Structures are given as C-alpha cells and as structure tokens.
Amino acid sequence: MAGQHLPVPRLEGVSREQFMQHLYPQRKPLVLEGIDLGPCTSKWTVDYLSQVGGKKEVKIHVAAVAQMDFISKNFVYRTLPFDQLVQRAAEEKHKEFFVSEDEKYYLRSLGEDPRKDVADIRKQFPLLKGDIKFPEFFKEEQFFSSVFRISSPGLQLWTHYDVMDNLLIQVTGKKRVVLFSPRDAQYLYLKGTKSEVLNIDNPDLAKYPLFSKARRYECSLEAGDVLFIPALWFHNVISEEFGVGVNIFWKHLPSECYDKTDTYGNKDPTAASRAAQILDRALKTLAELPEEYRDFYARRMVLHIQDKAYS
Amino acid sequence: QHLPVPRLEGVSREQFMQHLYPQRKPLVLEGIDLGPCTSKWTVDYLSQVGGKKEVKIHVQMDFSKNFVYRTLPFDQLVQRAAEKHKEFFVSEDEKYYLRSLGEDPRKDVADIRKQFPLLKGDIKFPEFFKEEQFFSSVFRISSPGLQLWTHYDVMDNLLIQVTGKKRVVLFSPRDAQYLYLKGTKSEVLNIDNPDLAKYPLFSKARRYECSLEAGDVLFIPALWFHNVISEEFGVGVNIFWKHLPSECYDKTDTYGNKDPTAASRAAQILDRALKTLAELPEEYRDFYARRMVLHIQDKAYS
Numbered sequence A: 001m002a003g004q005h006l007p008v009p010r011l012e013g014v015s016r017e018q019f020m021q022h023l024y025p026q027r028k029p030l031v032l033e034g035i036d037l038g039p040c041t042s043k044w045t046v047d048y049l050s051q052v053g054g055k056k057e058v059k060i061h062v063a064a065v066a067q068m069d070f071i072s073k074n075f076v077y078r079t080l081p082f083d084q085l086v087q088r089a090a091e092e093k094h095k096e097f098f099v100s101e102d103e104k105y106y107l108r109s110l111g112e113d114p115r116k117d118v119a120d121i122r123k124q125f126p127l128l129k130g131d132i133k134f135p136e137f138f139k140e141e142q143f144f145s146s147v148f149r150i151s152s153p154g155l156q157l158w159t160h161y162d163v164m165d166n167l168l169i170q171v172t173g174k175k176r177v178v179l180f181s182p183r184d185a186q187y188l189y190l191k192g193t194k195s196e197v198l199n200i201d202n203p204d205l206a207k208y209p210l211f212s213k214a215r216r217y218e219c220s221l222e223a224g225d226v227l228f229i230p231a232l233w234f235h236n237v238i239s240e241e242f243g244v245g246v247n248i249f250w251k252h253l254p255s256e257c258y259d260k261t262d263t264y265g266n267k268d269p270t271a272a273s274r275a276a277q278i279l280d281r282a283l284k285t286l287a288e289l290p291e292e293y294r295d296f297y298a299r300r301m302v303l304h305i306q307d308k309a310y311s
Numbered sequence B: 001q002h003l004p005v006p007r008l009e010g011v012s013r014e015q016f017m018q019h020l021y022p023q024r025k026p027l028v029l030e031g032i033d034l035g036p037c038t039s040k041w042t043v044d045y046l047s048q049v050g051g052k053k054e055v056k057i058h059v060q061m062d063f064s065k066n067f068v069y070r071t072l073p074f075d076q077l078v079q080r081a082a083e084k085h086k087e088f089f090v091s092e093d094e095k096y097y098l099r100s101l102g103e104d105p106r107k108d109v110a111d112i113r114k115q116f117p118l119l120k121g122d123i124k125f126p127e128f129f130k131e132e133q134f135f136s137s138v139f140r141i142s143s144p145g146l147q148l149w150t151h152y153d154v155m156d157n158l159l160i161q162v163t164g165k166k167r168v169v170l171f172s173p174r175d176a177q178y179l180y181l182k183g184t185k186s187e188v189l190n191i192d193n194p195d196l197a198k199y200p201l202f203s204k205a206r207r208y209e210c211s212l213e214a215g216d217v218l219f220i221p222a223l224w225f226h227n228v229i230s231e232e233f234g235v236g237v238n239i240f241w242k243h244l245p246s247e248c249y250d251k252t253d254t255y256g257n258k259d260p261t262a263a264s265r266a267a268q269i270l271d272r273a274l275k276t277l278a279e280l281p282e283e284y285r286d287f288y289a290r291r292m293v294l295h296i297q298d299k300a301y302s
C-alpha cells in the first residue's frame, strides 16, 4: 500500500447530478473526459490568445531551470503583457529574456489588486471568458476564484495543496499531475502548503526518507480534459507541452469558515489557524520544562491528538 | 531490544552526582553502605521492631480490579508476606502487598522517618541528593511472585533492595507509544510473554533488565517505566526526590505521580485547541490534527 502508484479514475459522459450527488461527496480526485467546454478548446491557439487576451500586463514566474525550487528560490518574479507571455511560453529558446534564453515561464493569474481581489477570469479576461463554459459542478454562491494557468513545457511546479475544491481544465496541451492523499502529509516534509521534495520521480531518500511511504495517484491531461481536486489534496503538475489551463476554485464549506484576507486559496480555515495559535501556546508553556520532560510530554500529546481527533 | 542495566561498584557520592546522574539513565549501584538494616531486617526482627501499627495492605495483578485493599497489623503483614498463609481475607494462597503511606493519605507523603522511626535508624539513605529535594521515602514489602503492573513516576527514584531478590525491567520514557499508556500505568500486565494479539506494539519496546540482590540500589531517573517482580520475599525501600525546582510540581500530589503543573496545563489548553478543530468536518479536522502532530514533533521532540 505505502509507496504505491495509482491511476486517477477517468470518467466520460458524467452528468451534473451524478457529479454533484455521487462523485463529488466521494472526496477523491477524478478526471472527466469529453465535457462541452465551449469552443475555447479549438480557438485558443497561441496567435489567438495573444490577439484576444493581449497586453493586459501580468505577474509572472521566470525560471532558468525546469525544476523550480522555493527552498532555494531559484526563480524570479517579473511582469509581462499577456500576449508576450503566451508567445514566450510556447517558445523553447528566447530572443529576448529576463535571465537566460532557455528560461521557462509560468503564469498563475491574479485579481486586479491581489490584496483584496481573488482572480476572476470573467472579471479580468472578459473576451476570453467568452470561449469557455465552466462546468456547472457547484452552487454559484460558493464560487471563489477562477485562474489562468499557462506554462512553458518542461516546467515543473512544486507539490502543494489548496483549501478550496478545484476543477482544473486543460484546454490546450498535455499536463501530468500526480496527487497525494491529504493523509499523506506526514510523508511530504511540508513547509506551509509546499513540500520540500522537489524531484518526486527520483527522490533523494537520504534527505527525505519518509517520502517513501507516499502513495501517489497519477494522471495526464489531454486538451479538453477536466480534473477535480478535493481540498487538501496535494498535487504536482508538470506541463509536458505548451498548454493553457483554467482552474476554478470553490467553497466546500460555509463561506463563514474561511479566512477573508485569503484571495489565493492557501490560507487555513480560521478554525484550523486559530487551533494552530492555541497549540503554539502549549508548545510554549511546556517549552521550558527541561528537554527530557518536554519530549516525554510532547509524545503524550501527539498520541492524544491521534486518538481524539484523527478519525 | 533486551538490554542489561549497567552494574557499578565503588561509585562515589560525587562521581554519581557529577558524571552519572546527569546521564539520565538507570543504573544499579552495588555495595553502598546502607547500614545494619541489610543485615538485621529479618522477618522475625522486622515483626518485632515494626510493631502492631495498622497498615494499608493490597491483596500477577490487574489495574480490571483483581486486587483488594485491606489493612493489617504490620508484624502479621510481614509474617504472612513471607508465607500459603493460613489466615487470609480472600484465599489460602492470598498474595500480600505493602506500600507505605503517610498519616493523612490525601494530605501527606509517605516518609520512613515519620512512620518507622526505630527501623529508620537502621538504614542510611545514600546522599545522592539535597534534603530540599527530598520528596518521599516508601516501605515496600511484597510477597514472592507478585507482579506489580508497569508504571512511571515523575520524581527521580532510588530503589534500595534491603532484603531478598527482586527483578525489574524498564523502558525508555520515549517508548511511551509502545506501552499503551492509561495515565501512568501501562496496559500489558504479563511482561514476559505478552499477548501481541491485543497489543501489537509492545514488541517494538526495548526492555532493559536487572536483578536486585540484597544491598543493591537501582537508580530510576524520572519518567522511566519499570516493572518489579519479587523473586524471593523481601523488603525494599525507595526514595523519591525532586529533579526540578520544587515549584514545577503538583502540590496536590502525595505520590510523585501527577504531571508537573506545566504538563497538566499544556494538555488542558491542548484539549481546547481540539475543541475548535473538532467543529470542522472530520476530514478537515483530521488533516489539521496531523499537521499539529507534525508541528509538535518538529518543535518539542528531542
């Protein structure tokens, strides 16, 4: 079981009700084939996205290296006009560039003022929103954000997770995506919503021994493919080609539970974040009992938590 | 996963304090001067000197209550303790136990000085700790083949075997996980051939092991689990003492068993943080519980 490699189930012809009432409550990743996405899927050539989306300047990642690394931040931020960015991500070599002729590009769309606006494709790319029919797989009152996702081929984003449920729509290009159950957290060596294990295919088990028990689900997304990701599910994407992605986040929970400053979808539901503050407190009172004693009692706690609150 | 506890002869008062004690590991100390006690505390001697003072007699045991509190006159207690004893409250092969406790059990600690003055004069506790850190002295009479369940104490302990053999096995505090701890007692009664059925984890527990001969002293650093099994009849005494600044402990504790106040409270607020988490759907609750124990492990462990 541990360290296994599963396929993410692929279903074609899934209905609204069957997704919403049968597949969704199942809380597992799943890919849907053949959904009517709108013509976006035959229109969004690079020439078109440049023309139609053009020149709305966006915040962008530039990396001189396929495997992007936040532990060493080996990439830099920059801005670019939408068309430019597109044209650049579809390239392999670059005449003009921010760091090297082979640097790779990564757009994760953001609301006009990232401080108070979630990203909304409808709001910020009105024409482009035109070509794409969001699958109606969730109550509208729970909509949260809609995000563009365009990357150079060979670009490896790192393993993270979000607090919202999420429909990732591969419109153009092939995407590889491996996923980890939320319960695989212990194995993932996380700093925040990120994992330190960059090379998942060929892991340095000297530094990340526990990564071994990690049971990975894998899937590759062709154009037209849609993938559902339950909240808290870890995921790692690699643009195998050039492609254009749109994701839709939405609330699985009462809007009341979420943190309102969070426009990205990382921040922990208030209850959890509060809990974490409480905990940091205990870790402090206990803290300056001698290490010997702290330790014994940290261990009691952990076992206790595992028993009252694990399921 | 089965070690011996080091035995050491000729360890100085100093050498121990300075270089051994701070190792925080269990040691048995051979050939300390305990006084005449080790010499004269015979069933017959004991019986005489002790007197007829009524004592709290308990009668392989189960903590499931397969024991029973009782009370007898000391001399008769020892005398039976050495016995199949004719007079019994439960059975002919009644097993007899004794763990000393001060006048008011809820108020005061046990203390050999206060409660066995004559007998006290026979034994010199080893000077391995300051008088200010003294916490209690206890008289331990048990009958042969009596199996007292596994527990830990919060005070450092000097178990002194004065008379008769006694086995004892121990476990790293950290082996808390494998012990299935119900408070300060562990669920696995028969330590030798454990029902791995009920408790699969007791296996992963490295168990240290020693045998006390009359005169031997076992140091048990606070937090070490130990299981004591009187092979022959005999009397032992143990002394608890505060390893931490006296304030750190629970005032209500007359046993040296209650958690340091810092622990007791931290676990209390912990129970709070669980009450908030609890209100999210189980699966979210779950995920963040795990993120909590990751956090505790990284920050507080070793």
Ligand SMILES: [Mg+2]
Pocket (backbone or CB within 6 Å): A161, A162
């Ligand atoms: Mg994401």
